[PDB]
Structures are given as structure tokens and as C-alpha cells.
Amino acid sequence: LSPAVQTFWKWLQEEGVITAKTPVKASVVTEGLGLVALKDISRNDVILQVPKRLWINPDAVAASEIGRVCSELKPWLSVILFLIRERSREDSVWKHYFGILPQETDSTIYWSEEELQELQGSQLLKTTVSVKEYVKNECLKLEQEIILPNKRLFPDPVTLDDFFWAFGILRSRAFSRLNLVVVPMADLINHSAGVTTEDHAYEVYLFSLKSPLSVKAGEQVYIQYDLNKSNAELALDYGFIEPNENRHAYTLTLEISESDPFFDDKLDVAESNGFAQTAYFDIFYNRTLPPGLLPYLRLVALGGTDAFLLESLFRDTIWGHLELSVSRDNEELLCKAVREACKSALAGYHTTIEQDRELKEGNLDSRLAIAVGIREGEKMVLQQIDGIFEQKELELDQLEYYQERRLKDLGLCGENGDILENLY
Ligand SMILES: Nc1ncnc2c1ncn2[C@@H]1O[C@H](CSCC[C@H](N)C(=O)O)[C@@H](O)[C@H]1O
Ligand SMILES: C[N+](C)(C)CCCC[C@H](N)C(=O)O
């Protein structure tokens, strides 16, 4: 099979992890390394359990020689260093383990500059930069503040590469479902759209892993990494995406600018209803607009004319009105703004959806395939959003704004009220 692999298995055997009780051998699959069922496994069947003696979370780093120095360090930062450190030591308890870990994945955090050009104009590109940058800073402060001072615990130099390496390992191997644990045995389980549950972790401490699906002898055992992540998210966290167009999403960012003459009043209204000065609305393909998006858009484009709704008089129904619409000038404004943002964003890509779809029709490199699928999806969402507001511009007169809703109770045609009045 593989050097460190055929050995890594041996390692677990003595640690009382892998026995003739566990029906699942590690194998080389299209997704790298994975768990192949050694024999017909059933639903919920615990495939393998690992002794907490083998975890690699904050609790294990706090108990090692670097447990002190990393005392005030944040959760991940502690594990980053720990992982790096153990990778160096030739007598580490995870010796056969690290010889198994992939030096890299297809996460965009590793993409070359050319590779990154394939995501030009994409939201994913932005996000990946930000993340790469941040991690960098936090990793440089660790060197200058922990790695270098304690030249006794960290003998070897630590490069950025090693950092991103450890980070990636975290982002693609941590089970934050119990918040940042790692399990050398159940670390080799891959993701599959076949699984639609999203609950496999367990603990009897101990880490118990159970296959949410009945696998036959020879086949691979999978799990659902996260039913709620977008493709842009699966792309960064792990190095893969799904064909499922329902994973395509595009998040819009809304904010009440401080230069807005009604900033103070608008922010009070927003906060009073669960929204901050800045708000993110995730828009998924074929899914309906998120609640709050429209009323927040209306608040943003409020304007002098409708500013009267910001008065103490409505501080109890203003949001209800925002949900029902303010006025035609208000609706037209936000539509205009949204459509313009969509068209502007659409122009930022270097390929058309037609080209992307044709590309997908041939054989693509894993990272090329990700960029293509990611950018095609984003264009679909942007165009769906644009489609939605284009319709809105047309039905701009079918909505019953504030004024009209206010006059829907005039009772013009009532009684000859004067008769009653002239009776006293
Ligand atoms: N469905 C899938 N398609 C492609 N790669 C996958 C995948 N599920 C898991 N992976 C890969 O495996 C990582 C999760 S850790 C799983 C073990 C991994 N196969 C290994 O050889 O070490 C992901 O970040 C990704 O690079
Ligand atoms: C790749 N590996 C299987 C190790 C983890 C995949 C992500 C699991 C997710 N954090 C959850 O706990 O629900």
C-alpha cells in the first residue's frame, strides 16, 4: 500500500485502537486516503473508536512540554504549534501519523498565483486572501512571541509554509462537533453527498465513529461534512466542491453608512430588530431571499421623504412597514442599487457561463475544476438575484406602499354622520 501507511496501521494496533474488532482498513482512494470497509458494515455501526490518549486538541497541548508557553494562546494557535512541533520530533507519539498527513490539499490557501487567477472577480478569491493574510499575521506573532523566545522547545526554524500547513490541517481535519479536536484514526474519513444526516461523532474519554450508511465489503465509508456550507466554503475549508447547484451561494453585504444623515435613527431601528451597522445576507441558488434582506435594503435607501417613519411614533411597527414596503421611490432605488451591483460584479469575471460549462465538459485539474465550478455558480446566483429585482422593477406598481396602506380604512362611504351629530 504505502510506507507510512502500512506502518501507521501498525502504530494504532499497539495503542489498542485497531483490532480484529474494527472492520475498516485504510486505502488509497480518488480523494486521497480513505476508509474502506473490511466487511459489510451496517447503518450506525461504530466503525472504529480512538483512545483520547491520541487526541491532539488544546487539552493535549496544555499537558505537553509546551503546555505552559501556550497558556494564554487562543485554541487553534496552541494546536498549530503543537502539530508543527510533533512533526519535527523523531520520537513523537504520532510518528507514523505525520508520515501519513498530506503536505497539501486543494484548499485555495495553497493555490499558486496562476491558479488563483482562475477565480478572478469571484467572492471566493476575496475570502481566501483575507484568510491567508490574517493567519499570516497571527502566525508571525507566534514565532516572535513563542517559537523564538523558547528556542529550547522549538529547535528547528518554522516557515510560513509550515504554518499554513498546520492551519490547513486544522480546517480540513478538525471535528468541531461535540470544538477543535483531531483524531488520527477517524481523520481518514472522506465526504460524500450520498450521506444526508450530518451526525457521526460520538464519545464513550474516547472518540467513536459510526458509518451513517450501510457499506458493502470493499467499498468506502463516508460522512457528510456539512449540509449547510456553500461550495465557496467547501472550497476553502477542504479542497473540493459539489456539482449540486444548491451549494452555490453569494453573500451580500449591507450597512448603514455613517455619512447617512439619518444614521443614528436607522441604526437604532436595525439593532432594535437584530441587525448591526453591517450585516451579511447569504443568498443561495434557488433558495428564497433571506428574511431581513429587503427590509434592511429599504432602511438603507430610506431617504428624506420617508424619514418620518424613523420617529418615536413608529419605533414599534417601523420594521413591519419595512417588511411590507415604504414607497415606490424607495423600492425603485434599492432595485436600481442591487441590479447595478450585480451587473458590476458580473463584469469582473474573465469567462462567461457558456465557457465555464464547456470547460466542465472536458477533463479538468482538481483546482481548475474548483475555480470553474465556483465561478459558474457565482454567476448563476448573481444572475438569479438580478433576475429577481428586474421582475421587481416591473411590479413596481403592484406593491401597496405606506401611504396607500394608511388610507385603506378611510370609510368614506359610511353613514350620514351629521344626522346623529345634530341630535345633541
Ligand atoms: N468528496 C471528496 N472529494 C475530494 N476530496 C475529498 C473529499 N472528501 C475528502 N476529501 C479530501 O480529504 C480532506 C479531508 S480529510 C480526509 C482524509 C484524506 N483523504 C487524506 O488522504 O488524508 C479534504 O480536505 C480533501 O482534500
Ligand atoms: C475531514 N474530517 C472528517 C476529519 C472532518 C470534516 C469536518 C467535520 C465537521 N467539522 C464536523 O464535526 O461536523
Rounded Cα distance, 241 and 108, in Å? 12
Which phi and psi (to 5°) does residue 379 adopt? -70, -35
Residues 6+ apart with CB under 8 A from 136: 160, 163
Q: How many residues does the chain have?
A: 424
Give yes or no: residues 209 and 281 share one domain: no
Rounded Cα distance, 371 and 117, in Å? 9
Q: Is 225 a catalytic residue?
A: yes
Residue 179 near ligand 2, beta carbon < 6 Å: no
Rounded Cα distance, 339 and 52, in Å? 53
Give yes or no: residues 49 and 175 share one domain: yes
Ligand minimally distant from the alpha carbon of residue 101: 1
Burial class (CB in 10 A: 0-12, 13-18, 19+), 164: buried
Rounded Cα distance, 376 and 185, in Å? 36
Sheet holding 32-36, edge to edge: 25-29, 32-36, 220-223, 190-191
Using alpha carbons, select from 130, 66, 120 the residue that is nearest to residue 92. Answer: 66
In a domain, 416, yes or no: no
Question: DSSP character for 305?
Answer: G
DSSP string, 154-177: --S---HHHHHHHHHHHHHH-B--
In a domain, 214, yes or no: yes
User: CA angle, 390 as apex, 389 and 392 as ends, to 5°?
Assistant: 60
Question: DSSP character for 245?
Answer: G
Q: Could you count the other beta carbons within 10 Å of the beta carbon of residue 180? A: 17
DSSP string, 337-350: HHHHHHHHHHTT-S
In a domain, 55, yes or no: yes
Question: DSSP character for 247?
Answer: G
Give yes or no: residues 252 and 224 share one domain: no
In a domain, 418, yes or no: no
CA distances from 294 to 49, 244, 316, 327, 334 (A): 48, 27, 18, 13, 9
For atom 9 of ligand 2, which residue has the closest CA?
175
Rounded Cα distance, 268 and 255, in Å? 13
- What b/e readout covers 233-261, taking b as 16+ CB neighbours within 10 angstroms? bbbbbbbbbbeeeebbbbebebbbeeebe
In a domain, 420, yes or no: no
Residue 173 near ligand 2, beta carbon < 6 Å: yes
Which phi and psi (to 5°) does residue 357 adopt? -60, -35
In a domain, 415, yes or no: no
Query: Hey, which residues does 284 pair with through a beta bridge?
Result: 249
Cell of 10: 501498525
Using alpha carbons, select from 185, 234, 204 the residue that is nearest to residue 370. Answer: 234
Give yes or no: residues 260 and 160 share one domain: no
Q: Which of 225, 227, 229 to mutate to test the pocket of ligand 2 (most atoms within 8 A of CB)?
A: 225
- Say how many domains are in the chain: 2
Amino acid identity, position 316: D
Last residue of a domain, one of 241, 261, 293: 241
Provide long-range contacts, Cβ within 8 A and 24+ apart, for 358-361: none
What's 128's domain CATH number? 3.90.1410.10
Give yes or no: residues 290 and 150 share one domain: no
Rounded Cα distance, 302 and 309, in Å? 9
Residues 6+ apart with CB under 8 A from 362: none
Give yes or no: residues 3 and 112 share one domain: yes
Give yes or no: residues 226 and 292 share one domain: no
Domain that holds residue 301: 242-406
Q: Are 216 and 38 in contact (CB under 8 A)?
A: no
Q: Which residue's C-alpha cell is 448563476? A: 380
In a domain, 37, yes or no: yes
Catalytic residue among 222, 225, 401, 402: 225
Residue 188 near ligand 1, beta carbon < 6 Å: yes
Q: Which residue's C-alpha cell is 442591487? A: 338
Torsion sign over Cα 53, 54, 55, 60: positive
In a domain, 314, yes or no: yes
Using alpha carbons, select from 54, 61, 90 the residue that is nearest to residue 182. Answer: 54
The radius of gyration computed from the CA coordinates of the chain, to the nearest angstrom, equals 28
Last residue of a domain, one of 241, 271, 294: 241
Side-chain-side CA neighbours of residue 349 (13 Å) = 24
Give yes or no: residues 250 and 351 share one domain: yes
Query: Hey, which residues does 33 pair with through a beta bridge?
Result: 28
Give yes or no: residues 313 and 225 share one domain: no
Give yes or no: residues 81 and 198 share one domain: yes
Last residue of a domain, one of 197, 225, 241: 241
Secondary structure (H, E, C), 16-51: CCCCCCCCCEEEEECCEEEEECCCCCCCCCEEEEEE
Give yes or no: residues 228 and 246 share one domain: no
Question: Which atom of ligand 2 approaches the CA of 190 most closely?
Answer: 3
Give yes or no: residues 75 and 186 share one domain: yes
Q: Is 177 annotated as a binding residue?
A: yes
Rounded Cα distance, 120 and 129, in Å? 12
Rounded Cα distance, 125 and 116, in Å? 7
- Can you give the resolution of this entry in Å? 2.5
Q: How far is the CA of 369 from the centre of ligand 2 (A)?
A: 23
What's 320's domain CATH number? 3.90.1420.10
For atom 23 of ligand 1, which residue has the closest CA?
238
